[PDB]
Amino acid sequence: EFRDDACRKEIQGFLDCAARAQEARKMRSIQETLLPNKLNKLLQRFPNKPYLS
Amino acid sequence: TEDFIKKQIEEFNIGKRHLANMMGEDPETFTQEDIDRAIAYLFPSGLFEKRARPVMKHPEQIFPRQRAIQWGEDGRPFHYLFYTGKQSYYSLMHDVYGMLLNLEKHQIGSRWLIKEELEEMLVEKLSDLDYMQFIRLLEKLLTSQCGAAEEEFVQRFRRSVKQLIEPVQYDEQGMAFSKSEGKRKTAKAEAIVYKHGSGRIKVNGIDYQLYFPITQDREQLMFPFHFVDRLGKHDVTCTVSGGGRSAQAGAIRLAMAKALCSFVTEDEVEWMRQAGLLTTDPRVRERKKPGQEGARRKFTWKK
C-alpha cells in the first residue's frame, strides 16, 4: 500500500541508484569531453588529393 | 614625418614656456602635471570623457608610434625577415626558438602581457592565434629551467599583478573606541564601538531592541559580534539615517563589523571578511526604464 515504512531498503536502493546514475552521467560527460574534432584536424593536416597538383 | 614631429616638439617647448609665463610659474621647474593643471584651469571643459578635454602634452604622447621606414634608398630592407610582413614578431619567435634549442642542448606575482601590450612592444598588428603561439612558446621557455640569461629575456613579457583597520581613538574619559561607517541601499550608518562594554547598543539614542522591534533586524545586529564571539563585551553607539528598517539594520551591521575589526585580531578580521561582514552590498534598486513596467518587468505582450 505504498507505505514507505515497510519499503525502506528498496527506497534507499532506488535513491542511491539514482545518485549513482547522476554521477555516471557527470563522469561520462567529462571523460568524453578519438574525438571527431581531433580526427578532422589530422585529416586536414594530411588531406585527400582527388586532383593533380 | 620626423621633421613634422621635430617641429611639433619645438612648438611644444615654446608653448610650455609661454604657459609658464601665463601662470607666472618658473619655466625651468614647470612640469607636465603643472602643464595639465594650468590647461585645465585656462580651458575648463566638463566633457565626461577625459580624452575629449583639452590636452597640451608632448608630441611623443600625442602622436602614435610611427613604424620607421624598413628599407633604405638601395631598396634592400633592413631586417632579414622583412618580407614576412611581421618581421618584429617573427624575429622574436626566432630568438625564443633559438633560446629553447640552447636550453634543450645544455640541459602569482606576475602575468603574461596582453596581446595589446605585445602589439605596442612590436609596433605591429598581431592575431589571437599568433599571441597564443607566442605565449605557449614563452611558457615552454619558462618551464624549461630558464636560467638568468633566459629569465632576463622572459621578464620583458611579464607584467606584475586585506581589510584596512581603522585607528583606535580615546574618548575624553580615556576609554578606547573605534569609529566606522557603512552604507546599504539608501541607509548610511556611523558606528562607534568601545573597547570594553556590556553589550549595550544605542541607535540614534534609542536602545536597539526598541529601535529595531524586528527579530530579523536584531539578528542582523547580533551577527557581527556573535561571529567573533564578543557578545556583551563591547558597547556601541550608532547613528543611522535613510532607507527602511532592513537597510538601516544592514548598514549598522556593516559599520559595526568595520569598527570591530580594529578590536579583533588579524585572523578574526580575515575570517569576518571571508564571512562577508566587511563587504559593502552593491545591490541597489534598479532604475525603471521607459516603455516597461519596472526595471525588468515589460508590458504584457499583445500577440
Binding site: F2, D4, D5, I11, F14, L15, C17, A18, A21, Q22, R25 | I214, T215, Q216, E219, Q220, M222, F223, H226, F227, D229, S246, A249, G250, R253, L254, E270, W271, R273, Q274, A275, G276, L277, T279, T280, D281, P282, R283, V284
Partner: protein, 208 residues
C-alpha cells in the same frame, strides 16, 4: 547581478573558521589561502551564524512569503512552531509516563521529520520519444524532493477548505499529521507514487 563573477558566496560557520590549522589537509589549507585573496559577497540579510539558525525553516518561510512581507511570514512561522510545541506539551502532560517516552516535543524535529515524510521519492516528468511526450516516472534530486514537500505543505495550508482557521493552527495541525504519517499531504505523496507506479510501463521512455 551587481556582483562581478569574481565574487564568491560567503561561508558562515564559526566552527569552520575555528577549526585547528593542524586538522586541515593540503587542499583545505589551499582553499583557505585562496579565499584569503578572493572577493566575497556581502552576508545576506536572511542568514547569520546564530546557533538557532535553521536553513530549512528559513526556506520554508521564504516559500510562505507573499509580496515581500518577511515580517508576516516569519510571524506565521514562529506562531506555527509555538502552536506545535504547545500541542506537544499538552499531549505530553496529559499522557502516561510510558508513552511520554515516545511523545516528542522538539518543534524543529517535528517539522524536519514531517517534511522528510512528505518528500516524494519518485516524480513524473514529461519525456518525449518520437515526438510524443509522456509522463514517465523518474528519480528526483534531493533539492526537488525537498521543494515539492515544502510546496505541497504550503499549498495544502493555503487551500480554502480550512475556513476561519489561522495559518499557525492550520500548519501546526498539518505538520503533526505528517509527522504521524497521516493527512492530506501524505495522501498526495502516496497519490503521486501510485500514479508513477501505474505509469511504470513507460519507464523505458526515459533516456537519461
Amino acid at each position: 547581478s551587481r556582483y562581478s563573477p569574481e565574487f564568491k558566496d560567503p561561508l558562515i560557520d564559526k566552527e569552520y573558521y575555528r577549526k585547528p590549522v593542524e586538522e586541515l589537509t593540503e587542499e583545505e589549507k589551499y582553499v583557505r589561502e585562496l579565499k584569503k585573496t578572493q572577493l566575497i559577497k556581502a552576508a545576506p540579510a536572511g542568514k547569520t551564524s546564530s546557533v538557532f539558525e535553521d536553513p530549512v525553516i528559513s526556506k520554508f518561510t521564504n516559500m510562505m512569503m507573499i509580496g515581500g512581507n518577511k515580517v508576516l511570514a516569519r510571524s506565521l512561522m514562529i506562531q506555527t512552531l509555538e502552536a506545535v510545541k504547545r500541542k506537544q506539551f499538552e499531549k505530553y502532560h496529559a499522557a502516561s509516563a510510558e508513552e511520554q517516552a515516545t511523545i516528542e516535543r522538539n518543534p524543529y524535529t517535528i517539522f524536519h521529520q514531517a517534511l522528510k515524510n512528505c518528500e516524494p521519492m519518485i516524480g513524473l516528468v514529461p519525456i518525449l520519444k518520437g515526438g510524443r511526450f509522456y509522463q514517465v516516472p523518474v528519480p528526483l534530486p534531493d533539492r526537488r524532493r525537498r521543494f515539492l514537500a515544502m510546496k505541497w505543505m504550503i499549498t495544502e495550508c493555503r487551500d480554502k477548505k480550512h475556513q476561519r482557521t489561522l495559518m499557525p493552527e492550520k500548519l501546526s495541525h498539518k505538520l503533526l499529521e505528517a509527522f504521524h504519517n497521516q493527512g492530506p499531504v501524505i495522501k498526495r505523496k502516496h497519490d503521486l507514487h501510485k500514479m508513477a507506479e501505474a505509469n511504470r510501463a513507460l519507464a523505458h521512455y526515459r533516456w537519461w
